[PDB]
């Protein structure tokens, strides 16, 4: 790193070309993201990395540095964006939590909770699609997804192409790459990336379920920002 | 004066009351600064008015509708308290389905009722709502309570809060939807 | 190796071809020549609106388009539904007959309408849904449907220059000048001329070729957009009607300023009746080329999309291209520097591109003399609505609103009018309204005028509008995606007569995140009609809501603070 | 069906002092006597219906949402009904004695809620008492000490289920094959110290109901007695283990009936009836029919169904409940608090002496078996036996699900009770809040689930 630019009146080192999110999470200081990976990159679907800079808000994991380049990434208007965005996909989908084996272990509901997110009040939507649980180790709940690519990018990288989101607008959902549409058709297997990396609790392992003790999950006593990336990241 | 609160389940599981009651001896003391109106644990059959009111669960039929209303108007500040009342919660899952399905899966379909077993519908059972919605849907909330239920320590800390005129806080740790 | 990295060139075409139903032995054959599993393909396949028609012999779908509404589309629907025992959006059991909607097909000033195999039916009626009934009940081809059912109108109610000069001369003409050979001296003529995109952005023309040619790679691409998917909009569908060989010459124009190998025009598929037009008038325009054949001509294609607004989006168009759903890039690198296939490329509206062919003809001088100084040269407008003359209208850059809007003889007493199609501004017809210049300086348009009378509901167009943002969301990313559904479930409540104050302030938030933090341009026009419902009409939508004593964080006086009272090409293109 | 000569209603919407929501009706004649009485469950959730297609492991955590104060209890029967599924019968030593002291933390919590903050402010304040001081509030200003101890019952009993599920109300710790966790010595220490001061005050609150009934037993046999079989769970030895077990049902002279019935096979044993005017269903065994086959359930049904209580004090003390004037007060209506308080003992000895036992600390957590599609699980919850049946695909996603809880069990005699109750107190017209409250006290008696019957 030689080349530096500002992130909230504060020097951060880069190499280029990275992007302001690569740069700022490189140098200990977060920005909060959903679809940005180390391994895998940024999607560019969740858009909580969203920063003031040039001079409008747009996405820090797009947005390249450059020398001097005056990013901020926290004020009023952020926050309130981003609790927003927090709030539409939990509307979204059936983000009930209570009932949910990723609680503590999620990272939507991590920073939502960081947020102050105390209440959606938007109007749920309380869609019907069912589990895929065709594969004999896997599931797919796809009410829980947030359509953050990273399984379908993991699944890729590693050459198993067993994943696709598909359809437009609120039709748009993960789906087998098979002929019969299950995940069990693929060559999808629980070894995979893709099986492991849902940082939600869409695309889970089957029967290892509320393993851990209220009080000792991930996200229990941390929050994202105060996490390394062996912790936050999976 | 001693100020005034009332609280109400309504589409819940009565659990968000348990909480409030987890706040142990501590009860005792709220005794001694609060009366009671309407509410599980007195027998004031109608609400009001008074100054706070404790909303467990969202509303599943219409007369849980009128109760809120009710209590809407009666109360000044009026908090929902845990998942169910913030967004609907357990029951509203059945907002995936059509609530007529499930009430023929149940009284009519099951493998282990009597034969000739009908869904019951008499004067006394009351109009069941397409949807369960949350409180906020119908009435307007001056504070949402999050969890499920919220622990008794979130409870105490918030309605002390409000007993001082100081402004409810939910820093990350405490903040639960579980 | 990413989403967007999985490119299938072919595919849209691929899936054209496939379907004259998508079975697992045609997926087969696909997945084998683009070498992507079966579901990946199919999953492609369900973006596009008109690869998810049920099959059947006749498939007929009624333009769910605000005018056609206002010109009775849904007693129409209904009434042909009714014969058949089938509601909107199924299929007969027998497979002879699918009903179903679509968004506006570009026939706005011919409601209402109906597109039926692929082919338009405007001005139906109580009379031609009876005939058209007896025909599917006796089962008659299509090749023997009286040919005029299918004629579309392309009325030019006021000529300027532009169009003048289109009659006047012929397309091939401009070869002759001595501009069209030297690339640079195009690039300056435009330049000169000030032109700016007529696509909705308003992109200075010659800054966005600038940024494609100070590219190393040779290799290039030219696209002209013909995805003419704003609602309201048909302005690009009489030019590509009357004048193909013009486009196609503006197109060569183009391509040779930025050093374009090849050339594409992206047809929509409700278009596709114009294919037959534009294939010979392709023909006579390749050989028109000189200089300096045979290894400097441009090769000209032409690529039919499948049904989605959102492919018009700069972007979006280059990936359906690349044969991937439409979802608009995550910039940068912009398509300027890296686009269709890697290669630096760049689009332009058909409006644009007839303008370059009429600038290297004439000069920059003759352009920037119309108009005003910022929005330089002749526009096309297309009127229709409650107005008794609906067409084309040329005017200047600059002409006041109300001058447009009278020109096309309103039929009962004015009341509101939406600009530059549901993506712009719903207004009230007021005197200070009308008075204001059409010009991307002031009050901007993409040529769409449509005009509403006082039989008119504005929360019923609203929610219109809010439907069609809804069901066009390309899904890529959260506040858009999710945003465009909360608005047009708030719409039927107010429709359900049940909605309260809460339920309209708490769209709030969602109408400033999708301004702020979406991909494209999409998100911020969605929310552009609830906004001016607001601006204009607070007491007519006040009207139709139950009290609610909800107090907002943000509300919606606060949104309106941060837009209308007080830019597209922010999230297209780089900055300067 | 309601044949054939009410003329008047009269409705107690919504009751006081209970868990959830019910209603009780009353219907009066043109004279002003009662005809009949009736208890309502008015509201409806579908769970388990809405619950096929979600993974069995979400179901122990997901299903206790349905109350309230028995979360535990189906916690428990979720998790044991699972056991089976995965092919485990006998759990291992740490995981059945973790899930044991949690069980026996809810009944001694629910049973010192009811009492104290739910049916106390009656029987020790007056029936008839002026409705503002009729509660937890009114007691906590006279009788301070009384409500002191009981709230601090409760509150061992709760940190007790914290300790083991993880947090008080909707824990996760029971798991298929056992349990996710242990004690740690400070936990274990910690509530060992506190275990014999705790059980002294339910041995005082257990003094206290019989003086009680020796003062009031003749205004108490008012309320009725009841001449219906006592259905309950018992262990092979036959004591009360309110943990697990097998059926037994005795008639009104009990007179063992059935005995050692695998409830596995409640599908054969018992079959449910279902009224118009209630979402509650009525369950009776079905080689019986109704009404002879109807039952109950509860504290006292348990204490006459056992042949012992593996405590000496709770043993002594129920020894006492079942001789008393002249074993009328077991059968009556007013006597299931004598029965209930005797159990809250008993669960208070069961942990004073559980706590001391090591295996708490241990690691024989969880247990593997072999797989199968059916799952049942019974448990006696704080009111009444409860029974959860599950049915999993090769999926792992739930086929079907019946929850039969222990509130709906004793549908039929708390009608019966009810309308006991209206004739004893309301055929004497005319009516008022305190002879109203005078219903309720009857149906406060039971501690019925409205929530779990809720479902
Ligand atoms: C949702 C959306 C839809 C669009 N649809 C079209 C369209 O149908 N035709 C068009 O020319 N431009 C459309 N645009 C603008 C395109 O970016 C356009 O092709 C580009 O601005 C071309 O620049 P030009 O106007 O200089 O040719 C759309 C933009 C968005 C965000
Ligand atoms: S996936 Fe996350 S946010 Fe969604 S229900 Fe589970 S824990 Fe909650
Ligand atoms: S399943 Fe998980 S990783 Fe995959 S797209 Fe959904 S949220 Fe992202
Ligand atoms: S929020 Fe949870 S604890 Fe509170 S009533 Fe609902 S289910 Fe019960
Ligand atoms: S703003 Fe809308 S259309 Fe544009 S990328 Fe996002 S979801 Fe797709
Ligand atoms: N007790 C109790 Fe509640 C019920 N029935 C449970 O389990
Ligand atoms: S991290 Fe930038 S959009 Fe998800
Ligand atoms: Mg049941
Ligand atoms: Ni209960």
């Known amino acids: 790193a030689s080349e530096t630019f500002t992130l909230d009146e504060e020097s951060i080192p880069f190499v280029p070309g990275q992007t302001v999110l690569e740069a ?211 | 004066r001693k100020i005034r609160i009332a609280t109400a389940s309504l589409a819940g599981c009565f659990g968000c009351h348990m909480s409030f009651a987890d706040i142990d001896t501590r009860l005792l003391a709220l005794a001694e600064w609060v009366t009671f109106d309407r509410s599980p644990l007195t027998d004031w059959k109608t609400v009001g008015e008074c100054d706070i009111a404790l909303i467990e669960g969202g509303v599943c039929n219409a007369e849980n509708v009128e109760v809120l209303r009710a209590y809407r108007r009666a109360a000044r500040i009026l908090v929902a308290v845990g998942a169910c009342a913030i967004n609907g919660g357990l029951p509203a899952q059945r907002n995936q389905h059509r609530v007529e399905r499930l009430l023929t899966q149940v009284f009519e379909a099951d493998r282990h009722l009597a034969p000739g077993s009908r869904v019951p519908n008499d004067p006394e059972l009351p109009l069941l709502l397409e949807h369960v919605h949350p409180i906020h849907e119908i009435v307007r909330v001056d504070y949402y309570l999050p969890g499920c239920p919220p622990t008794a320590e979130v409870i105490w800390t918030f309605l002390t809060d409000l007993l001082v005129g100081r402004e409810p806080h939910f820093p990350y740790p405490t903040l639960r939807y579980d | 190796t990413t989403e967007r990295q999985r490119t299938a060139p072919g595919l849209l075409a691929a899936l054209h071809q496939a379907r004259s139903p998508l079975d697992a032995q045609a997926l087969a054959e696909l997945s084998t020549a683009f070498s ?239 294919l037959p037009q534009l294939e010979a008038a392709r023909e006579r325009i390749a050989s028109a080329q000189a200089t300096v054949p045979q290894a400097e001509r441009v090769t000209l294609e032409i690529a039919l999309g499948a049904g989605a607004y959102v492919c018009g989006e700069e972007s979006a168009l280059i990936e359906s291209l690349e044969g991937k759903p439409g979802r608009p890039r995550v910039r940068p690198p912009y398509p300027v520097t890296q686009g269709y296939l890697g290669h630096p490329t760049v689009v332009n509206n058909v409006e644009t591109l007839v303008a370059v062919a009429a600038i290297v003809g004439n000069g920059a001088a003759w352009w920037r003399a119309l108009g005003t100084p910022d929005s330089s040269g002749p526009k096309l407008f297309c009127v229709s609505g409650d107005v008794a003359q609906p067409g084309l209208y040329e005017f200047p850059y600059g002409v006041a609103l109300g001058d447009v809007v009278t020109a096309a003889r309103p039929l009962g007493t004015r009341y509101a009018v939406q600009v530059s199609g549901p993506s712009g501004t719903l207004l009230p017809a007021t005197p200070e309204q009308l008075a204001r210049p059409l010009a ?12 509403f009378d006082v039989r008119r509901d504005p929360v019923a167009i609203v929610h219109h509008f809010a439907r069609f943002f809804a069901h066009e969301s390309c899904g890529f990313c959260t506040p858009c995606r999710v945003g465009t559904q909360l608005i047009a479930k708030t719409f039927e409540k107010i429709a359900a007569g049940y909605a309260t104050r809460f339920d309209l302030e708490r769209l709030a938030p969602a109408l400033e995140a999708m301004r702020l933090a979406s991909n494209c341009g999409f998100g911020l026009s969605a929310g552009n009609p609830v906004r001016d419902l607001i601006a204009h009409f607070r007491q007519q939508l006040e009207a139709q809501l139950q009290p609610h004593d909800f107090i907002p964080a943000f509300s919606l006086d606060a949104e309106l603070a941060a837009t209308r009272r007080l830019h597209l090409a922010q999230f297209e293109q780089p900055e300067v | ?26 219907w009066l004649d043109d004279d002003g006597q009662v005809v009949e009485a009736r208890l309502h469950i008015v509201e409806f959730r579908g769970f388990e219906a809405f619950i096929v297609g979600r993974p069995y492991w979400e179901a122990p955590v997901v299903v206790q949402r349905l109350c309230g104060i028995c979360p535990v209890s189906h916690h428990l029967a979720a998790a044991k009904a699972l056991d089976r599924l995965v092919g485990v019968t006998q759990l291992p030593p740490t995981a059945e004695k973790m899930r044991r002291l949690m069980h026996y933390g809810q009944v001694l919590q629910s049973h010192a809620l009811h009492f104290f903050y739910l049916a106390a402010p009656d029987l020790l304040l007056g029936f008839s008492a002026d409705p503002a001081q009729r509660n937890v509030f009114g007691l906590a200003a006279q009788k301070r000490e009384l409500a002191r101890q009981g709230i601090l019952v409760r509150q061992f009993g709760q940190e007790c289920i ?25 936990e274990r220490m910690a509530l060992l110290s506190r275990a014999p001061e705790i059980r002294s005050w339910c041995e005082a609150a257990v003094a206290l109901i019989e003086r009680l009934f020796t003062e009031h037993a003749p205004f108490f046999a008012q309320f009725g007695s009841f001449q219906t079989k006592t259905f309950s769970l018992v262990a092979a030895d036959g004591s009360l283990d309110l943990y697990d077990g097998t059926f037994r049902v005795k008639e009104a002279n009990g007179a063992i009936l059935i005995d050692h019935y695998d409830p596995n096979d409640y599908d054969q044993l018992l079959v449910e009836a279902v009224r118009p005017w209630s979402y509650m269903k009525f369950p009776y065994l079905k080689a019986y029919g109704e009404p002879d086959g109807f039952y109950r359930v509860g504290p006292s049904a348990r204490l006459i169904n056992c042949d012992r209580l593996t405590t000496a004090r709770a043993e002594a003390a129920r020894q006492r409940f079942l001789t008393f004037d002249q074993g009328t007060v077991a059968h009556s209506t007013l006597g299931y608090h004598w029965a209930r308080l ?105 501690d019925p689930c409205l929530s779990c019957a809720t479902h």
């Open chain 1, 24 to 234: 700022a999470l490189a140098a200990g200081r977060y920005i909060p993201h959903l679809c940005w990976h180390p391994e895998m990159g940024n999607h560019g679907s969740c858009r909580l990395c969203v920063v003031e800079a040039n001079g409008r808000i747009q996405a820090s994991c797009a947005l390249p540095a450059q020398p001097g380049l005056q990013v901020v990434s926290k004020s009023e208007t952020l926050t309130r964006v981003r609790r927003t965005l927090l709030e539409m996909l939990f509307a979204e989908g059936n983000h009930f939590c209570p009932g949910c084996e990723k609680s503590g272990d999620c990272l939507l509901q991590a920073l939502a909770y960081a947020h102050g997110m105390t209440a959606s009040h938007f109007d749920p939507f309380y869609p019907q699609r069912r589990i895929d649980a065709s594969h004999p180790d896997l599931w797919l709940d796809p009410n829980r997804c947030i359509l953050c690519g990273l399984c379908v990018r993991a699944s890729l990288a590693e050459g198993k192409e067993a994943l696709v989101i598909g359809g437009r607008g609120i039709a748009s959902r993960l789906l087998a790459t098979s002929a019969s549409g299950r995940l069990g058709d693929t060559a999808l297997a629980a070894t995979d990336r893709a099986a492991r990396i849902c940082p939600v609790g869409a695309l889970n392992f089957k029967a290892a379920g509320f393993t851990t003790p209220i009080g000792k999950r991930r996200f229990d006593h941390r929050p994202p920002e105060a996490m390394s990336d062996k912790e936050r990241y999976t």
């Open chain 3, 36 to 274: 992507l599993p079966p579901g990946e393909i199919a999953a492609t396949a369900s973006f596009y609106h008109f690869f998810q028609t049920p099959p059947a012999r006749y498939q007929i779908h009624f333009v769910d388009h605000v005018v056609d509404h206002h010109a009775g589309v849904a007693a129409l629907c209904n009434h042909l539904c009714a014969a058949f025992a089938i509601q909107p959006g199924q299929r007969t059991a027998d497979a002879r007959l699918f009903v179903g909607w679509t968004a506006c097909a570009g026939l706005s000033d011919q409601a209402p309408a109906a597109l039926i195999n692929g082919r338009p039916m405007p001005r139906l009626d109580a009379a031609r849904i009876d005939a058209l009934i007896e025909k599917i009940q006796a089962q008659i081809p299509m090749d023997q449907w009286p040919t005029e059912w299918f004629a579309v109108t392309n009325a030019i109610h006021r000529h300027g220059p532009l169009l003048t000069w289109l009659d006047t001369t012929p397309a091939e003409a401009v070869f002759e000048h001595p501009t069209a050979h030297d690339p640079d001296a195009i690039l300056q003529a435009v330049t000169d001329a000030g032109l700016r995109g007529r696509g909705g952005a308003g992109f200075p023309t010659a800054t966005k070729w600038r940024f494609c040619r100070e590219n190393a790679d040779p290799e290039r691409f030219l696209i002209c957009n013909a995805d003419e998917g704003e609602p309201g909009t048909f302005k690009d569908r009489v030019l590509l009607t009357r004048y193909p060989e013009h486009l196609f010459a503006g197109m060569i124009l183009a391509a040779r300023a930025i050093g374009a190998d090849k050339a594409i025009l992206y047809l929509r598929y409700e278009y596709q009746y114009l």
């Open chain 3, 440 to 451: 991307f300086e002031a009050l901007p348009c993409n040529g769409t005028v449509m005009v």
């Open chain 4, 1 to 26: 069906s309601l044949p054939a000569n009410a003329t008047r209603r009269v409705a107690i919407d919504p009751l006081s002092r209970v868990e959830g929501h019910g209603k009780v009706t009353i």
């Open chain 4, 162 to 186: 914290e300790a083991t599920a993880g947090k008080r109300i909707h824990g996760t710790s029971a798991v298929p094959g056992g349990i996710h966790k242990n004690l740690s010595r400070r």
């Open chain 4, 342 to 446: 005797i159990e809250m003992l008993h669960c208070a000895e069961l942990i004073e002496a559980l706590l001391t036992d090591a295996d708490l600390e241990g690691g024989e957590l969880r247990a593997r078996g072999q797989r199968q599609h059916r799952g049942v699980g019974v448990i006696e919850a704080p009111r009444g036996t409860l029974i959860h049946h599950y049915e999993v695909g090769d999926d792992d996603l739930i086929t079907y699900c019946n929850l039969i809880v222990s509130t709906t069990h004793n549908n039929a005699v708390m009608n019966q009770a009810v309308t006991t109750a209206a004739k004893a107190f309301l055929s004497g017209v005319t009516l008022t809040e305190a002879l109203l409250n005078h219903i309720e006290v009857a149906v406060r008696a039971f």
